[model samples]
Target: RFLKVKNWETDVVLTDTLHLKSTLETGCTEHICMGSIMLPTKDQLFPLAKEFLDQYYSSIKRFGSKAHMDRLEEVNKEIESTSTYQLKDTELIYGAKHAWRNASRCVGRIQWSKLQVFDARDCTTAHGMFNYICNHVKYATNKGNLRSAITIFPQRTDGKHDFRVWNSQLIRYAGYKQPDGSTLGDPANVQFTEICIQQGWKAPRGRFDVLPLLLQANGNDPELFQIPPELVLEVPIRHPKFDWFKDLGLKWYGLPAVSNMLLEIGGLEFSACPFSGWYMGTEIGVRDYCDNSRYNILEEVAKKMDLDMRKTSSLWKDQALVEINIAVLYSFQSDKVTIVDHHSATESFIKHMENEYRCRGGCPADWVWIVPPMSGSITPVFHQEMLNYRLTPSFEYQPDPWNTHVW
Candidate 1:
């Protein structure tokens, strides 16, 4: 039965249950969220390639090397021949940082200058991939003092690859659907859990289980690698004043590594470049744990806070959402985990925009993702007007994990 939500005049319908059973069945769709892509044309690649080459030469000027720099004729010819020309270390770094700077979807570009880059292009074996990823985990986690980082594996000029990391993030929990259909821990990872199960992974019977990594290093088969427990840092969510919140057993990984996104640099695509940043609290607090199709804990959280759940006019859901975000930020701070509040993050974006305005004439932004989820009107970014366009070297959304598509 469709229930009438309060504010919509008691006639605009909404689902009563937080985890509507029907929605959970399609929970696997999260993997498909980044499935779209726009292939760059030859016309587009020439200018972007020229820009990268010029910058590459500019970046390495202190070293005064011109061996690769002088190949402008060959580079331009190669541009005509190939869509993605190979990039040097300097070019790779520039493209990665610019990908961050140009990504309108990201609100944390203020730290784009601070990204640490690693070259793991030599890694072709399953063990090699695991070791490099573990290294990424160790360095980025930094014992809860999180740092933004990226480790680049081999790439395909034509966007084909022998390897891939299936998980969007390096750290994500397994969601086990119980016999009664209730999910344990992060329901966002249920699709991953199923794949892991099929791939010989034996997930423990618990609500909060850290998932083993799925790695494909060759054309033969994919391998599952367990992230060493010590290398992964998880912050337990607890509120400042509420003792009951500590017992919720909620937690999240400090670093958010999006491994699935393809890093398009100078026309080349590094499909397996896993990158991370310090998480915005609402990403976990408001969306992952609090979304209706996810952990869906608001109603329960309201009951725990003893709010009036019957009257939507009481704004119990809104209240619970804030408390949950409060718990997230508080817990991370208490645990010495690096995290940023939405207000501070959006403020930084404005700073980034202003800085870009002075340096690059104007800035590009996606208003849809630039604004914070909670208190949009309260945040300065809610009022920001941005001019948006496509530019490369760029980071592009790739296809789904189980889908037999590749680009």
Candidate 2:
């Protein structure tokens, strides 16, 4: 059991016992906490399937009902005959919503119940997948009024027919190796951009070039499909007070769509479920633009502000960090795009945790991820101790297709 809360006002203590039932291994040891582990080994499918069936029935308050017993036997017979079974449409939607709610690393799960699930399980070819993905982008983007959504492609039947989306995100910039051994765009995507070029994509080599979607169907080689430029909503960064900020020419997409995660629901694995949510400002300002290996614009922004760059004690980086984040917030708002600042987002997460504790007894959380990259102690989440655990109907990181036999 883990301590849930200590009510100092009433001198009462509460404990969470959910971890007692979690069969998922966290790779944690007594000596070290592996809270940052990206992926865990897969569990046996049949057991997980049965467990989810029970959970689904319990969710609907139908546990021990005739329909619940019938579903169990139906699944058993299907598996015995064909070695696999498909989830009903309602089951898939319920599981997807639960997956978002159970995402330990997500701080915006207050909106988990409001997600729009696009079921693309009918896609049997890369071309059809592209069409469905394009529709997803158009709907989720919503012309900068970004909506939380997930497009779930077909589930994996066997190793040979696993459908996969090769891009880590649905929309990301291309990184080109410059002639002088420097990188021209987002350095994070250099390898992926190289792969696109090798696969016959014509790289324009721009600093903010949006990479095409690499879709793999039937476990064959992935095919590249260019995302229609009109569907992508971009916000140009401009500061509220600084006249020089717009000259920096910084911008970011309104939608943060993660495309490569595997969606596990009721013993089924969906290899190409692209999930999207509106951006958190610090994701662009701190991690993307100012990280040393990323855009690395802190020094440049500080120089433009005429700060004392030579001294570490000058706090030049901190000042620039605030300005950049402000610009990110201002620009998105100016463009009528949906975005959340770190302060409000973290506060909402706290409320979400309270709600979860009242409803489900505990909420799984990861401190490293819930805390903002820029302001650690200043944020409410930083002071909160959290318990990390894995739950089913969850989204998980899978090995890259190229690195595994699934390719």
Candidate 3:
């Protein structure tokens, strides 16, 4: 008889749980193992780590340049000699000992011979140049490090003062020039009412109740609201004039006439459902309402009004009836009964459990039916029968020791 065998049939086979735990532990411990787990193959991990370390070493080695290193050492010595730590003294001389006695004393000695040989002005310039070179060297060694530095100067404008107030103010206002260069109005001569009238301004009709309170209340203060009251008052009028006032009065009168002419030319009824005359019916009603007295006369005095205006009655009445019917049908459809009988059996089973398993004294004050609250009755225990029956028989299992050991 011939038999087919799967790959790795002879190799060791480790339990699934043991293999998973071992893989997790090894990946966490060794960076190489962690990198290998991230990459597809082990070959990629070592090369990547080696390249990063080589670049870091190359950066540090560049600072070993003789000229740059020598300059850094000189700056370090200058810094140590000039810097000082404060100290207290017990001894005192009679009547006004030196006022500078309490000042800091330098820990490192300043070589007077070195100072004399160094031209103070030339040394100052050379020290700055050397410091710049040293910083460049340090940056190269530290992989292009950058930082901010602050220095306090010894000069004073007044006695023991640090800076000049008048000079600082001049610097702040220097190079000032207006782009437009237009003269602004003087406050005494600026008149808001005259400006509004010249612009043909109209008063707003709508009222904002909160606006008066916002103006009177301290809550509207600039520090709190961060907005000036003048800005709030600057909102523009939305509805400027009556719709009928558009296009001077001629166009308003010409619209109905022009619409009738178009309808006649098209061989359509002027009062038909989809015609322009019918569309203008709403506008006609609005116009009549504005006139007040002429509104009641629309239907009764049809022959007296313009032919275009007379058709408004039938158009409006028909539209009103149609709208009423639509509203009634919508209400009827919305009121229809809907049965919600899903999961009735599941609900009945839950009700039975709630009644049977409920505790005395109203099931404890804090206990909820949704998620049972923790109580002393609850405990953990191993179910031996479940653990034993769930496992495969020992005779049916075969272990390969070699593959198991590798894991």
Candidate 4:
């Protein structure tokens, strides 16, 4: 839906006007892409497509005032008439060529036959898998699915690959080195270690449960690197200073506070009494104040809370902190609303979550729901039920063990 056509426009304008125009264009693309890519069902695609077309039309109205709209329309029609079949053929050819190139380039560089200790594809795959896992963990944490988040750690399949060495080499190049000249550990592990430390999970001890899950889910064989949970304690620690509270304020209170809030709101429950229960109590109490007839009061409260939090020393000055707070607030408010309204509110909450995470390098926002490294590019389709599903399936799936092809 969002077109990134190169050289489509070549004009100079006043600096302010150019900035405004660029912002508008970028906003339009984001709107189209978010709507198109995130819809859960194919049925939504049609309306989204229509919305995209309408957006394009609106752009023309705003920025193509001096241009011939009919000419543009005719050009699009002609392009559409010729592009369908030709583009398909061209894509086929290009895909084959690219695959061939990738294979050939990886031949001497990788030990595809013997699992060379440094395959580039493995690095890419592992990183992709790591990002996917982190995305899910963060999503669950934000959604008040604390138990679900904790369960994700154990689902990882401990697997080892030639790419493990390759990843280590990458780390050495970036100023981290292995103790025994063995590329047995990598920087991604370091990131995982930090995440565990922040969550107060056992550091080295938890790695066994976490690593294999990543490897298995990411297409590596779990048997290749199976290790007992106790062995996780032996995994080397990589400490990186992540001053969550200092950097993210109330947002950085970590999972504990968020979990507690969710329990209080009635949206989340903890089987362990005061330690865990419906966190939605307070928010639900305000439901009547925010009912359909007095919905503005809820909006006002949200807006005011947003403003108040931004002005506070603990929450102000950091975008990530602000975003985390907003996400928590939105999650609480959303539980009291209808599906349509919940979706609307949740989408905005996700946007801010993505923005702050991106700004702070805490997580990658693109692959929020699904893990990657599949045969084809994977997209996540968010479902509200995903948050409530206490026993969700692991994203990690076993790939064919004998298929050692890199590309």
- Among these predicted structures, which one has the highest lDDT? 2
Q: Write the per-residue lDDT of candidate 3 for residues 1-407, one digit (tens) a residue.
A: 11121113223221222111111122234345332232111233223222322322333464446644543344344334543111111111100011111101100011101111111111122233233223322322222121111111111112222111111100000111124562122111113222222334332211211111001011111100111222211111111222221211111110111100101100111110000000111222333222333222223222322234436655654343223222222322233211111122223323322232242101100011111111112211110000010110000111211122211
TM-score versus the correct structure, for each prediction: 0.84, 0.96, 0.12, 0.18
Error of 2 at 407 (Å): 7.3
User: Residue 234 error for model 3, in Å?
Assistant: 35
| Clashing pairs in model 3, backbone N/Cα/C closer than 3 A | 12-403
- Models, CA RMSD each: 10.6, 2.2, 38.5, 22.6
Q: List the residue pairs that clash in candidate 2.
A: none
> Candidate 2 residues 102-206, lDDT tens each?
898999999999999999988889999899899999999888888889989888887689889999999999998898999999999999999999989999988
C-alpha lDDT of candidate 3 relative to the true structure: 0.19
Off by over 4 Å in 2: 5-14, 36-43, 405-407
For each candidate, what is the lDDT? 0.76, 0.87, 0.19, 0.25
Ordered by lDDT, highest first, the candidates read 2, 1, 4, 3
Residue 276, candidate 4: alpha-carbon lDDT: 11
Could you give candidate 4's per-residue lDDT for residues 1-407 as a string of tens digits?
Answer: 21111111222111111111111111124235432233222242233323333334453464344333543454345435543111122222222222212221111101111210111122235444444334433443344333222111111112232222111110010112247553222333454333334434443442122333213224343222222233221111111222222221111111221110011000111110101111222122223123333211333333433444545564332333233333444434444211112233334434433342344221112223321111112122132111101110001122222344242
Q: Candidate 3 at residue 156, lDDT?
A: 14
Per TM-score, the best of the predicted structures is 2
* Cα lDDT for residue 268, candidate 3: 10
